[PDB]
Design a binder for this molecule. Structure first.
Ligand SMILES: [Ca+2]
Length: 732
């Protein structure tokens, strides 16, 4: 019954296959193939569909797979360079039939994404009973939707005893919204049903989609012996009762937003887990036992009770939170909680645990602690001999992923660009990824079209020039000077952007923008650039459009002036559904002068608790005559979960509204210090708790604001008053 066929004949061949047959798949690249598979083996003799040699059967293009029947194994498929058109990439069902006792192993899904970010769907969907998903490598999902979900819609899908083991769940970048889980087991609608799913011996590496790496929303599951290495997320016991969390390793290595386990519901056991180097806070914390809503509806937060945590090791964990989430709705503290024989070791002077409500429901027995201070809590014992040295390699040596599967730098090439009609446009089109475009002479670099950045490129002014090369737009249809699309990564330095507008030609739509729907995460670095003469209110010099995302945007040493619109806009997600477009934005040593719109506008709206960002740092910026209209904001930072504004100067700005505006949650980490505000609007927030470390009101004294020199004169009271002893505002 052994056959060696190509993939197109698999469906009819699998139907004719009998128990024990082996169907070998010829090597090749199959494009636009929707496999609908049905086969029936038996417990002693399964039907094995295998790549003739694994790792050389490529399923590309508009493709997906559906599997139903009994005792059918599929081995050695490689999904890449394509996208699923309808459901998931792999489903354990086919029409109305499900797959039982089937197995998908030694397969790879590798950046199986479409070209537009504005879609949502899964990659692997589990149905039926007693199916196994093992030794697979899944990585690179760039759009919304959980990577792998266990569905419990029908009785045939519940009490599944599905085994998700020895897989490598690789990089999943920050989605910027809810819906970026790597694994979800159940939903709120079937939460109190038993799923009996086993997730064991898996490797979660850089699974950073959202707060939940694994979202358990069903009952009586087992999550054991997994490794979460540097994941910006947690294991969430979100819905359902009696889940077992045993022998897992949460290895954050001191990286940001790394967490462990967040607990809701009743009856769980958390035993023998390693919590190592976790920096996450609140819902990202190393450990969290939530407050709950009394008599909660199915989709809210149910009472945490009858939970035993024993023989866990909390090594260098920043935040261990009891009653986390307490507010006017989640008013019910955990009850009948037992911490037994746990080990707490930390080198930092953070609290052992933090409580946000009464913890009378907690019992502590024979816990041992080694912190830099003496713990005087009943049920804890200090031991200064405990070492925070841990042997992590037993977690790093475990075999995971497909057996045959293994796995932003310059080229060094520089392209000189003279001035002319389209010198920069043709230099970019001749450039490879990693090339440097060196504008070699001063003058006007005209552009009839946008510079489309679909690769990694660096555009710089030659270091010998004494003035910034000026970019001007003389096209017939409105575009931005630079447009980042799929695959683009941009560092730009020393360039001036003049959107003046030419006679008889279209107006430019901004300086740098990222095309909406761009599915590849992009990096943007702007250094010593200039933006001016954009004279419509709806434009921005630098804009991250809706349905785009960057993990890191850096803007430094730049000059934004004489514009009717904004300078930096990352406020496109206006639907108040928790979405945002930049994880970390850093603004350094920038001048904002004579703008009708905001110097900076970042927005994340809604009450969603599923994300970490955006994070913002603003340092040594000078804001002069910016956004004085009624209810304007010189800086609009709504929903920024972490903001640090330091060593800045606001003058004659925000007079009709606010110089800096927040609409913050009480737990948002906002730090506004060393700010000079002269004849400017107030620093506006909802709770009024930003404090007032070094808030001055001196009159700034520029060297020569007419020639663009906004440094302070040496005798100005803004001199040497920054926290780093440099100048308030731009400096050095
Ligand atoms: Ca979620």
């Amino acid at each position: 019954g052994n056959r060696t066929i190509d993939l197109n004949s698999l469906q009819s061949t699998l139907e004719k296959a009998g128990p024990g047959d082996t169907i070998y798949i010829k090597s090749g690249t199959y494009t636009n193939i929707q496999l609908q598979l049905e086969g029936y083996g038996k417990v002693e003799e399964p039907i094995v569909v295998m790549a003739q040699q694994p790792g050389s059967v490529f399923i590309e293009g508009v493709s997906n797979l559906r599997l139903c029947g009994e005792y059918v194994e599929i081995n050695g498929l490689h999904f890449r360079n394509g996208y699923t058109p309808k459901g998931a990439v792999i489903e354990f069902r086919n029409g109305e039939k499900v797959a039982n006792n089937c197995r998908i192993t030694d397969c790879v899904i590798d950046y199986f994404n479409p070209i537009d970010r504005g879609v949502s769907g899964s990659w692997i969907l589990l149905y039926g009973r007693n199916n196994r998903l093992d030794h697979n490598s899944i990585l690179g999902k760039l759009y919304a939707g959980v990577t792998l979900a266990v569905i419990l819609n029908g009785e045939g899908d519940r009490n599944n005893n599905h085994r998700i083991d020895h897989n490598y769940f690789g990089e999943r970048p920050i989605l910027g919204s809810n819906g970026g889980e790597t694994i979800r087991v159940g939903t709120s609608h079937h939460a109190f049903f038993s799923s009996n799913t086993v997730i064991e011996d898996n490797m979660f590496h850089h699974c950073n989609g959202e707060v939940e790496v694994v979202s358990i929303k069903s009952s009586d599951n087992i999550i054991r012996n997994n490794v979460f290495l540097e994941c910006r997320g947690i294991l969430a016991l979100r819905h359902g009762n009696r889940n077992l969390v045993e022998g897992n390793a949460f290895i954050g290595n001191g990286l940001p937003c790394t967490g462990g386990v967040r607990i809701v519901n009743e009856g769980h056991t958390i035993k023998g887990n390693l919590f190592y180097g976790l920096k996450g806070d609140r819902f990202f914390a190393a450990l969290g036992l939530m407050n709950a809503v009394p008599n909660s509806l199915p989709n809210r937060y149910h009472h945490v009770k009858d939970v035993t945590l024993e023989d866990n090791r909390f090594i260098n964990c920043d935040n261990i939170l009891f009653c986390v989430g307490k507010d006017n709705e989640r008013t019910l503290p955990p009850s009948n909680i037992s911490f037994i024989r746990n080990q707490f070791i930390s080198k930092s002077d953070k609290a052992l645990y933090q409580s946000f409500d009464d913890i009378s429901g907690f019992t502590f027995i024979d816990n041992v602690v080694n912190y830099p201070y003496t713990v005087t809590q009943r049920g804890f014992q200090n031991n200064t001999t405990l070492s925070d040295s841990i042997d992590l390699k037993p977690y790093m040596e475990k075999k995971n992923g497909a057996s045959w599967y293994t796995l932003l730098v310059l080229t060094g090439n520089e392209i000189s660009v003279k001035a002319g009609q389209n010198t920069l446009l043709e230099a970019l089109n001749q450039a490879q990824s990693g090339d440097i475009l060196n504008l070699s002479e001063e003058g006007v670099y005209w552009l009839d079209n946008t510079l489309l950045i679909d690769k990694y490129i660096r555009i710089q002014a030659d270091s010998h020039l004494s003035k910034r090369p000026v970019l001007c737009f003389n096209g017939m249809s409105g575009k931005a000077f630079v447009t980042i699309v799929n695959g683009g990564n941009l560092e730009i330095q020393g360039l001036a952007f003049n959107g003046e507008g030419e006679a008889g030609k279209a107006l430019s739509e901004g300086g740098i923008t990222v095309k909406s729907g761009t599915i590849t995460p992009y990096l943007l670095t702007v250094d010593n650039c200039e933006f001016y003469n954009f004279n419509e209110s709806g434009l921005a010099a630098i804009r991250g459009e809706k349905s785009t995302f960057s993990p890191m945007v850096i803007i430094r040493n730049s000059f934004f002036h004489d514009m009717s619109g904004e300078a930096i806009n990352f406020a496109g997600e206006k639907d108040d559904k928790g979405k945002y477009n930049v994880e970390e934005l850093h603004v350094d040593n920038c001048i904002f002068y004579r703008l009708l719109g905001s110097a900076l506008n970042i927005y994340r709206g809604g009450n969603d608790e599923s994300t970490s960002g955006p994070l913002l740092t603003v340092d040594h910026c000078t804001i002069e005559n910016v956004d004085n209209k009624e209810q304007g904001s010189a800086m609009r930072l709504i929903g920024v979960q972490s903001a640090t504004v330091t060593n800045c100067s606001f003058a004659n700005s925000g007079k009709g509204g606010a110089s800096i505006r927040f609409n913050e949650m009480s737990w948002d980490k906002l730090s506004v210090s060393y700010i000079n505000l002269y004849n400017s609007g107030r620093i506006a927030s909802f709770w009024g708790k930003l404090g007032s470390k070094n808030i001055t009101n001196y009159r700034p004294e520029y060297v020569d604001a007419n020639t663009g020199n906004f440094y302070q004169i040496s005798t100005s009271p803004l001199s040497n008053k920054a926290s780093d002893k440099k100048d308030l505002g731009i400096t050095q």
